[PDB]
């Protein structure tokens, strides 16, 4: 039957951070932290994760695309508060700690998680007419080892 695999979230050790609109009743049931402005929350799990978050701030990284189903290297900025337009299933609200990346085409809306050569940055937050909004996990790394530059 099935074949394609996907996580749609970031599993870190005994803490799993996923998008609020993507979290399940179980995520909130055992949720330790949750930032509305970041639309992200952290829940505890028994099974160790398989992802390593990067503690870097490189302006260049690679994001995953659902349409392309491939990894896309793109440069982005880490704007604090970004007003997300009412799209998909979210109302025009303010989001904190979101990184945006302007692609070079029309496609590119959602995907998975934004990872850098050092580690994991964040998950797909909101998107624009040609930009990629990602919720950085650099504001709540308390989950596992962090990536450094030294």
Applying CB under 5 A, which residues contact Zn ion? 56, 58, 116, 118
Please state the separation of Cα 125 from the chain's center in Å.
6
Quote the least distance from Cβ 28 to Zn ion, whole Å. 31
What residues contact residue 143 under an 8 Å CB cut-off, 6+ apart?
12, 13, 14, 15, 17, 42, 49, 53
Which helix or strand (DSSP H or E) is residue 27 part of? helix 25-29
- Our CB check for Zn ion shows the closer of 34 and 144 to be 144
- Separation of alpha carbons 90 and 39, rounded Å: 10
- Our CB check for Zn ion shows the closer of 20 and 118 to be 118
Quote the least distance from Cβ 149 to Zn ion, whole Å. 8
Quote the least distance from Cβ 117 to Zn ion, whole Å. 5
- Separation of alpha carbons 51 and 112, rounded Å: 13
Quote the least distance from Cβ 130 to Zn ion, whole Å. 23
- Our CB check for Zn ion shows the closer of 88 and 117 to be 117
- Our CB check for Zn ion shows the closer of 58 and 81 to be 58
Please state the separation of Cα 95 from the chain's center in Å.
13
């Amino acid at each position: 039957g099935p074949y394609g695999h996907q996580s749609g979230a970031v599993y870190v050790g005994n803490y799993k951070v996923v998008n609020r609109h993507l979290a399940t009743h179980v995520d909130w049931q055992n949720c330790v932290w949750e930032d509305y402005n970041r639309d992200l929350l952290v829940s505890t799990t028994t099974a160790h994760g398989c992802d390593t978050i990067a503690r870097c701030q490189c302006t260049t990284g690679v994001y995953f695309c659902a349409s392309k189903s491939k990894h896309y290297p793109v440069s982005f900025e880490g704007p604090g508060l970004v007003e997300v337009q009412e799209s998909e299933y979210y109302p025009k609200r303010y989001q904190s700690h979101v990184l945006l990346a302007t692609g070079f085409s029309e496609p590119g809306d959602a995907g998975g998680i934004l990872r850098c050569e050092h580690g994991v940055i964040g998950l797909v937050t909101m998107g624009g007419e040609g930009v990629v909004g990602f919720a950085d996990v650099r504001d709540l790394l308390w989950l596992e080892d962090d990536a450094m530059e030294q």
